Amino acid sequence: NSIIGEKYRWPHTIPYVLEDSLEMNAKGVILNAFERYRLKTCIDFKPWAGETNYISVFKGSGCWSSVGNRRVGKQELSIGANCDRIATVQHEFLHALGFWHEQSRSDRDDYVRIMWDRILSGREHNFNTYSDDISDSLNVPYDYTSVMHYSKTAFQNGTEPTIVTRISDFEDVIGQRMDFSDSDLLKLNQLYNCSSSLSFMDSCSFELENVCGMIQSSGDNADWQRVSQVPRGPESDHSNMGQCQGSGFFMHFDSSSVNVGATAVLESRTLYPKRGFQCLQFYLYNSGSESDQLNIYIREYSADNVDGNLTLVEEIKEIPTGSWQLYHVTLKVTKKFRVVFEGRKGSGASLGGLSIDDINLSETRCPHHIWHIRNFTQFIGSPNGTLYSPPFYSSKGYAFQIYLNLAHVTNAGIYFHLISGANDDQLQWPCPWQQATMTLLDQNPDIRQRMSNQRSITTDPFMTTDNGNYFWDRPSKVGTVALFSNGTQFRRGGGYGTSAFITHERLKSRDFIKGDDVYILLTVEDISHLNST
Amino acid sequence: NSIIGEKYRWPHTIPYVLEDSLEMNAKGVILNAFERYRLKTCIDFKPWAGETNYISVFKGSGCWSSVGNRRVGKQELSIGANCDRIATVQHEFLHALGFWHEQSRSDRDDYVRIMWDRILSGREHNFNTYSDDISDSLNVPYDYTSVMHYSKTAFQNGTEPTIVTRISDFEDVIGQRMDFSDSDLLKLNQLYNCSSSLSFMDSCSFELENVCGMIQSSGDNADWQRVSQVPRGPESDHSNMGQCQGSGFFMHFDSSSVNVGATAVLESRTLYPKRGFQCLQFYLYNSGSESDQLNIYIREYSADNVDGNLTLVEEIKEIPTGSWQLYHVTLKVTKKFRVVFEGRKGSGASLGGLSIDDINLSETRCPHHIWHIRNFTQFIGSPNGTLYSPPFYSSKGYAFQIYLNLAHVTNAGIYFHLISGANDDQLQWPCPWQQATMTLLDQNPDIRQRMSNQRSITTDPFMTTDNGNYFWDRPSKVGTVALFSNGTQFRRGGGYGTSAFITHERLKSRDFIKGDDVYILLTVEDISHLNST
Ligand SMILES: *[C@@H]1O[C@H](CO)[C@@H](O[C@@H]2O[C@H](CO)[C@@H](O[C@@H]3O[C@H](CO[C@H]4O[C@H](CO[C@H]5O[C@H](CO)[C@@H](O)[C@H](O)[C@@H]5O[C@H]5O[C@H](CO)[C@@H](O)[C@H](O)[C@@H]5O)[C@@H](O)[C@H](O[C@H]5O[C@H](CO)[C@@H](O)[C@H](O)[C@@H]5O[C@H]5O[C@H](CO)[C@@H](O)[C@H](O)[C@@H]5O)[C@@H]4O)[C@@H](O)[C@H](O[C@H]4O[C@H](CO)[C@@H](O)[C@H](O)[C@@H]4O[C@H]4O[C@H](CO)[C@@H](O)[C@H](O)[C@@H]4O)[C@@H]3O)[C@H](O)[C@H]2NC(C)=O)[C@H](O)[C@H]1NC(C)=O
Ligand SMILES: *[C@@H]1O[C@H](CO)[C@@H](O[C@@H]2O[C@H](CO)[C@@H](O[C@@H]3O[C@H](CO[C@H]4O[C@H](CO[C@H]5O[C@H](CO)[C@@H](O)[C@H](O)[C@@H]5O[C@H]5O[C@H](CO)[C@@H](O)[C@H](O)[C@@H]5O)[C@@H](O)[C@H](O[C@H]5O[C@H](CO)[C@@H](O)[C@H](O)[C@@H]5O[C@H]5O[C@H](CO)[C@@H](O)[C@H](O)[C@@H]5O)[C@@H]4O)[C@@H](O)[C@H](O[C@H]4O[C@H](CO)[C@@H](O)[C@H](O)[C@@H]4O[C@H]4O[C@H](CO)[C@@H](O)[C@H](O)[C@@H]4O)[C@@H]3O)[C@H](O)[C@H]2NC(C)=O)[C@H](O)[C@H]1NC(C)=O
Ligand SMILES: *[C@@H]1O[C@H](CO[C@@H]2O[C@@H](C)[C@@H](O)[C@@H](O)[C@@H]2O)[C@@H](O[C@@H]2O[C@H](CO)[C@@H](O[C@@H]3O[C@H](CO[C@H]4O[C@H](CO)[C@@H](O)[C@H](O)[C@@H]4O)[C@@H](O)[C@H](O[C@H]4O[C@H](CO)[C@@H](O)[C@H](O)[C@@H]4O)[C@@H]3O)[C@H](O)[C@H]2NC(C)=O)[C@H](O[C@@H]2O[C@@H](C)[C@@H](O)[C@@H](O)[C@@H]2O)[C@H]1NC(C)=O
Ligand SMILES: *[C@@H]1O[C@H](CO[C@@H]2O[C@@H](C)[C@@H](O)[C@@H](O)[C@@H]2O)[C@@H](O[C@@H]2O[C@H](CO)[C@@H](O[C@@H]3O[C@H](CO[C@H]4O[C@H](CO)[C@@H](O)[C@H](O)[C@@H]4O)[C@@H](O)[C@H](O[C@H]4O[C@H](CO)[C@@H](O)[C@H](O)[C@@H]4O)[C@@H]3O)[C@H](O)[C@H]2NC(C)=O)[C@H](O[C@@H]2O[C@@H](C)[C@@H](O)[C@@H](O)[C@@H]2O)[C@H]1NC(C)=O
Ligand SMILES: *[C@@H]1O[C@H](CO[C@@H]2O[C@@H](C)[C@@H](O)[C@@H](O)[C@@H]2O)[C@@H](O[C@@H]2O[C@H](CO)[C@@H](O)[C@H](O)[C@H]2NC(C)=O)[C@H](O)[C@H]1NC(C)=O
Numbered sequence A, B: 001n002s003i004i005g006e007k008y009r010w011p012h013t014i015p016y017v018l019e020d021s022l023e024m025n026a027k028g029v030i031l032n033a034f035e036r037y038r039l040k041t042c043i044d045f046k047p048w049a050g051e052t053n054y055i056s057v058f059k060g061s062g063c064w065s066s067v068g069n070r071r072v073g074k075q076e077l078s079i080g081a082n083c084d085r086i087a088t089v090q091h092e093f094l095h096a097l098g099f100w101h102e103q104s105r106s107d108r109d110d111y112v113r114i115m116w117d118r119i120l121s122g123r124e125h126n127f128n129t130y131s132d133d134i135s136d137s138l139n140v141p142y143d144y145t146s147v148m149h150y151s152k153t154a155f156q157n158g159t160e161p162t163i164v165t166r167i168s169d170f171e172d173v174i175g176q177r178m179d180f181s182d183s184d185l186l187k188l189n190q191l192y193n194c195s196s197s198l199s200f201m202d203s204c205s206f207e208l209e210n211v212c213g214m215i216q217s218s219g220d221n222a223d224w225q226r227v228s229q230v231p232r233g234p235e236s237d238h239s240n241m242g243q244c245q246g247s248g249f250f251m252h253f254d255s256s257s258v259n260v261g262a263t264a265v266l267e268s269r270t271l272y273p274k275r276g277f278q279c280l281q282f283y284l285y286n287s288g289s290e291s292d293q294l295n296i297y298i299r300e301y302s303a304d305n306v307d308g309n310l311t312l313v314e315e316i317k318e319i320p321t322g323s324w325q326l327y328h329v330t331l332k333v334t335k336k337f338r339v340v341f342e343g344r345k346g347s348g349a350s351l352g353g354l355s356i357d358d359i360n361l362s363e364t365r366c367p368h369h370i371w372h373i374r375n376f377t378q379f380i381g382s383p384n385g386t387l388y389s390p391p392f393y394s395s396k397g398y399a400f401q402i403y404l405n406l407a408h409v410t411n412a413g414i415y416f417h418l419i420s421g422a423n424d425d426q427l428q429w430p431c432p433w434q435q436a437t438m439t440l441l442d443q444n445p446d447i448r449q450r451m452s453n454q455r456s457i458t459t460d461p462f463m464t465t466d467n468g469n470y471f472w473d474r475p476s477k478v479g480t481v482a483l484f485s486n487g488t489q490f491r492r493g494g495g496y497g498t499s500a501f502i503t504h505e506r507l508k509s510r511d512f513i514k515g516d517d518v519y520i521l522l523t524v525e526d527i528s529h530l531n532s533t
């Protein structure tokens, strides 16, 4: 799978150029793809400063790349039409880093059969095998879930598949387009001898007695206890639910046995930031009162104060009872710090306390908005699987809604819609170059093992409708009349996304559904600064 | 914990000299310690050929080492009296590689308290802390189970401990002397950017549908099935038992539904040996007939034959029913190969079949003899916890027995005894320099995550008894009269080992006991070639 040769190795930081030919949406997606490499690998990217060999990302015919550092200077990489997908950009960069397709492995014929008469004339070069003297498997087995593995339909001539997996169970498994596989990362990190990453900071599921070096100290006689269960709730930890349930642990602040006002803190070990912006995320459970609250502080260690600078950064109040709730906290720490979790028993009828699990800290931006869908499984393949998100306002002030269609018998669809907002009178119309990134979260206990499904679209102010008007024009002017859950009327603009966001079989895999809950993360930002590069 | 600086980094292969001052037993143990580094790290060792900087292992006062590559040329490392323990040698080499003690971590005072007035005058230098500008923690938390962490008694003046863990649960946990911790390896592999190892080849627990790339093909209509359970047995896989049981898998050859003589093969992926000698190990379960057998073949791929050279290397017949059985198969493959597992239904009343789990392949020597103790837990702290192994013959022909004492209220003891054998008339007496290595196996599903408890002793032909005679002289001449399980009388020589082999609390931890089974691996070899180095 990997190329044989030291000459084909790029430096750990790759010089890049995002050519002006590229689509605006492609540019924003290619930069998001680099963020996945910065969190899961030791491979970084930096804009070309005059280096001998660099990657020139441009809009050619389709999506393609050379395998490994060719040492030709300006090395082309095409992200053409319909290639503006994060996984597609990751795939083509894994080629550039020195990997062939997974079905190109020297042993591929022992796992899959290539139906040669079914491949489109002039696209066979994609199905070439490379022997031991040309390729290295790096002692990793054939991976059907590889992001470098083609789908059964890849360049098919008709309805019959080109790649027939010898084991029938993997027929629909091959060709997944979500993220790197655990096996993909293993080969890549072994090839460049990756030790760290730029974005990853910490993951804490409390599966060991040392609890990721988290210190619990209080002069209030109140303490955070490592438990596998709580009688009032939860019956089991978050980490393992659709796995084993009772063999997993979480921290718990019992409020039932403490005085009102009593606090107990849970501090992290000393953390060293490399970027200056962070995203703290965790799962919370409340079996106590609605008066009970969680406070997030940051203890920054400067030279002028070795005892630290404690600053309150979030007050989580009136936490909904009887279910695990995912929370995100935006941080902007530049010096070494400690995350401080403070539970507080309030004035109200309590019977349990506050539980915390799957704490993940990364140097990335938090999602702008979160759409949390409860009792999800009932909607899969349901006639009533036509869901509309609550309304949301973007950074620049545009009002938007998300439409998730699960009524289909095979694929789930997702669509971005502009809606009539309050700021509409002072906004630029048609909406110019706003990239809306919709992510179906794989709720894995470790951020590094998450294969989240993502799709991004950009608002084109020149995209004209099927009748004279602009697609992204003011919804009051081009949209359809709709009704909010309370009864208030509004105008829903055109819907833009995909009909094949994820298959129902993939949706029901990994941890996209966890505790019958689903989280679709949203980030809408202006990307107009990418037209001039 | 790790030293700050690039100048302190040794090359991946360390030049060494095992000085003649060293004890014979120390020499054999230091070479065994290198074998642990070759399997779990990318750090290799080679005898000094004239390199500028090298490690000079000699017998000084106690066990000590400099932290990191000091770049002084001949870098001393002392393995003095009573330091001839694998973990002690690993500890002192982790110092040499660039690590301080775990209780030397800049944040150590947040986890442990140093009782300074209780440390022996002149041994405080072992309890020094090194701040961020001098040390790096490499984003790994404080590890109480670290092999680099001192015991609570370390250089104590009296009965009161010098290291008091702030959390009382870790009081007896600190100071373990078995092997590297998962956290130790993580820091070390990150420091030298380790990708591979010399000895590790493969680990297969069948926890994924792709089954480590293992191909099952047969022209007999017989097949190996990936199951979580078998109605006749086993009720659950081996990998997870004292964890979850039913969420784990294993391969099964159902013999109940096939004709007599029918075979099904399970092949491995193409494997590439680096040393030329291997050790295949797996766990077997039989719910079928005693006539049912397992055949192990090797399919070696040479240039003159691309179809391979299939050779039968083991015939496992009359496998005991209703329990997981650990097996070892010695291999000497030099070219790329495939391990071939062949199940065969025999002539006898069957009701199930053959099950296989936790397959581990490493480029190491297999244990000479295996002492398998069933229903172990009943003996811990029992007056009848005085166990003697069955008799065994060494490579050179000496007869020996192992004594395991579990009757003690806190610690388990192990002792090596020479016994009267058949070859005794033609053997050299007293027995000269035979290293007997006793290993309490941590039955972890992954060989790389095994923290097996090991102790080695060497027969000194000058070691004189408490009354004129030689300790290792002919047992018929110096030993005591004893009785074999069947009633036959023999002479049991002197017992040499330790009274603190493992504590009962450590014995009951990890996977030393699994399915109430224990395996003590034995290797007895002549080490007389180490006197001249
Ligand atoms: C049935 O269901 C329907 C659907 O749910 C219901 O419909 C909804 O009803 C709500 C209630 O009527 C509507 O809420 C109102 O929303 C508007 C708009 O909110 C957004 O825009 C704000 C402005 O952003 C601009 O400015 C910032 C910088 O300041 C820029 O960064 C932005 O880019 C943006 O700039 C663009 O626009 C300006 C022009 O506006 C241009 O000049 C620029 O060039 C740009 O183009 C923004 O501030 C809002 O964000 C805040 O609020 C969020 C929600 O609370 C919160 O998540 C954010 O963090 C942020 O918080 C801050 O403000 C809140 C208070 O709102 C604080 O609590 C918080 O601490 C922060 O400080 C958002 O993005 C909003 O302006 C309205 O607010 C007025 O009224 C509320 C009280 O109702 C007051 O609290 C406000 O102060 C404000 O008061 C105005 O009026 C005063 C006189 O009365 C006057 O004195 C003040 O000066 C001020 O003008 C409402 O909150 C909702 O929009 C609507 N949705 C839809 C789709 O229809 C329906 O009502 C329901 N019916 C029933 C019966 O149930
Ligand atoms: C109550 O309980 C008690 C405890 O359990 C019982 O006591 C036991 O009883 C057994 C039965 O009586 C005893 O078994 C006998 O063991 C001896 C010794 O075995 C060991 O040594 C063998 C020789 O090794 C030397 O040579 C090799 C190279 O060839 C070297 O590498 C060695 O270093 C070593 O060299 C030293 O010694 C020589 C001198 O001997 C010097 O010259 C050198 O300088 C060195 O110092 C060795 O071959 C044995 O290993 C084989 O057997 C193992 C067990 O089967 C097996 O694990 C090994 O893999 C290996 O296998 C090979 O051989 C077996 C057959 O034994 C094959 O199946 C296999 O395929 C392999 O080829 C071991 O290390 C042994 O010699 C005896 O064997 C004779 O008798 C058996 C049948 O009983 C025959 O099968 C043999 O061929 C042999 O026959 C002799 O006699 C013939 C005439 O009758 C003659 O013609 C032949 O030429 C030959 O001389 C026995 O197997 C056991 O030792 C004893 N234990 C104790 C502690 O007391 C008690 O009996 C029981 N009572 C009751 C009633 O229940
Ligand atoms: C103890 O910590 C305090 C908090 O630090 C912050 O939080 C922690 C957790 C980390 O994330 C830190 O990285 C972070 O700084 C310190 O106070 C902070 O001081 C900084 C300046 O050093 C100050 O920054 C300013 O922020 C505004 C943005 O507005 C914020 O604050 C308001 C009011 O609270 C709030 O409503 C907003 O939502 C925002 O959060 C920004 O516009 C400023 O820009 C100016 O300076 C830049 C310099 O490059 C210049 O280019 C611009 O043109 C412009 O003039 C500036 O960045 C933080 O707001 C403030 N934190 C809070 C919560 O108020 C504290 O620092 C000391 O006290 C301060 C009052 C000030 O005197 C500082 O100089 C002192 O160092 C620190 N104390 C010690 C002893 O270390
Ligand atoms: C197809 O495979 C056969 C098996 O190969 C072995 O097994 C596989 C699984 C791998 O582990 C291989 O690395 C391994 O070789 C091949 O047959 C083998 O050929 C080798 C020679 O190439 C031969 O080696 C000799 O072994 C003896 C030790 O005795 C062993 O065998 C006996 C009898 O079976 C058995 O009772 C013992 O327990 C041992 O297992 C050793 O003394 C020999 O030493 C001589 O040669 C060395 C050379 O360095 C010299 O220094 C010495 O002084 C001395 O003369 C030698 O190493 C293997 O025994 C034999 N395997 C078996 C099971 O018999 C096979 O090779 C071809 O056929 C052979 C008959 C012979 O003509 C070879 O030259 C041929 O290559 C191979 N076939 C093909 C086409 O590839
Ligand atoms: C999630 O569903 C429960 C129950 O819904 C029922 O089961 C579905 C599978 C489907 O058949 C529905 O038609 C049924 O009505 C909702 O109600 C909760 O029920 C539990 C019962 O133990 C009760 O304790 C909760 O308090 C109820 N919740 C509320 C808010 O009343 C629940 O509301 C659904 N969740 C959402 C967000 O709609």
Ligand SMILES: *[C@@H]1O[C@H](CO[C@@H]2O[C@@H](C)[C@@H](O)[C@@H](O)[C@@H]2O)[C@@H](O[C@@H]2O[C@H](CO)[C@@H](O)[C@H](O)[C@H]2NC(C)=O)[C@H](O)[C@H]1NC(C)=O
Residues within 6 Å of the ligand: B374, B375, B378
């Ligand atoms: C392992 O123990 C079983 C049962 O022993 C009993 O339980 C112990 C905890 C202790 O209290 C002993 O004194 C008891 O005698 C032995 O017997 C097996 O029992 C099962 C019962 O289901 C039976 O199916 C097996 O066939 C029995 N095994 C044999 C060989 O008869 C068992 O023998 C002990 N194992 C060994 C190696 O001694």
Ligand SMILES: *[C@@H]1O[C@H](CO)[C@@H](O[C@@H]2O[C@H](CO)[C@@H](O)[C@H](O)[C@H]2NC(C)=O)[C@H](O)[C@H]1NC(C)=O
Residues within 6 Å of the ligand: A119, A120, A121, A122, A157
């Ligand atoms: C897809 O299949 C068709 C049918 O095989 C190919 O079209 C031609 O079909 C005729 C017979 O009807 C053959 O003789 C030709 O060789 C085919 N090829 C061409 C180039 O004309 C078609 O080419 C296939 N591939 C593509 C790219 O469409």
Ligand SMILES: *[C@@H]1O[C@H](CO)[C@@H](O[C@@H]2O[C@H](CO)[C@@H](O)[C@H](O)[C@H]2NC(C)=O)[C@H](O)[C@H]1NC(C)=O
Residues within 6 Å of the ligand: A042, A193, A194, A195, A196, B190, B191, B192, B193
């Ligand atoms: C991989 O190991 C090498 C050992 O040389 C490290 O490379 C050096 O890193 C320093 C910074 O720490 C640079 O100044 C040097 O230029 C690097 N030298 C070489 C030869 O590349 C590297 O940092 C290790 N990787 C990690 C992440 O630990």
Ligand SMILES: *[C@@H]1O[C@H](CO)[C@@H](O[C@@H]2O[C@H](CO)[C@@H](O)[C@H](O)[C@H]2NC(C)=O)[C@H](O)[C@H]1NC(C)=O
Residues within 6 Å of the ligand: B119, B120, B121, B122, B157
């Ligand atoms: C162990 O503790 C004893 C007692 O504190 C030390 O012995 C001396 O004790 C006297 C008082 O009885 C002190 O005044 C001395 O300072 C002690 N030290 C010496 C060197 O005499 C003893 O030294 C301690 N440490 C060792 C290494 O035994």
Ligand SMILES: *[C@@H]1O[C@H](CO)[C@@H](O[C@@H]2O[C@H](CO)[C@@H](O)[C@H](O)[C@H]2NC(C)=O)[C@H](O)[C@H]1NC(C)=O
Residues within 6 Å of the ligand: A190, A191, A192, A193, B042, B193, B194, B195, B196
């Ligand atoms: C760590 O990465 C470096 C990349 O340079 C690899 O080092 C080279 O390895 C080749 C053999 O594969 C040697 O001939 C060179 O001398 C090495 N160069 C340097 C600068 O060290 C190294 O092999 C990688 N480690 C692993 C195990 O993949």
Ligand SMILES: *[C@@H]1O[C@H](CO)[C@@H](O)[C@H](O)[C@H]1NC(C)=O
Residues within 6 Å of the ligand: A378, A379, A382, A383, A384
């Ligand atoms: C309609 O929605 C309910 C939940 O309110 C769900 O249980 C049901 O299955 C859906 N209807 C059908 C016909 O599937």
Ligand SMILES: *[C@@H]1O[C@H](CO)[C@@H](O)[C@H](O)[C@H]1NC(C)=O
Residues within 6 Å of the ligand: A531, A532
């Ligand atoms: C790119 O940005 C500049 C900003 O000044 C703008 O003038 C230009 O029109 C933009 N290019 C296109 C093709 O819209």
Ligand SMILES: *[C@@H]1O[C@H](CO)[C@@H](O)[C@H](O)[C@H]1NC(C)=O
Residues within 6 Å of the ligand: B378, B379, B382, B383, B384
């Ligand atoms: C003696 O051995 C038996 C097993 O045979 C064990 O169950 C028992 O506990 C032991 N005796 C005592 C007093 O512990």
Ligand SMILES: *[C@@H]1O[C@H](CO)[C@@H](O)[C@H](O)[C@H]1NC(C)=O
Residues within 6 Å of the ligand: B531, B532
């Ligand atoms: C070391 O080995 C040599 C082998 O010839 C032997 O002569 C010598 O006596 C041995 N040394 C000792 C100290 O026994």
Ligand code: NA
Residues within 6 Å of the ligand: A205, A206, A207, A237, A238, A239, A240, A248, A249, A250, A357, A358
């Ligand atoms: Na957990």
Ligand code: NA
Residues within 6 Å of the ligand: B205, B206, B207, B237, B238, B239, B240, B248, B249, B250, B357, B358
């Ligand atoms: Na298993």
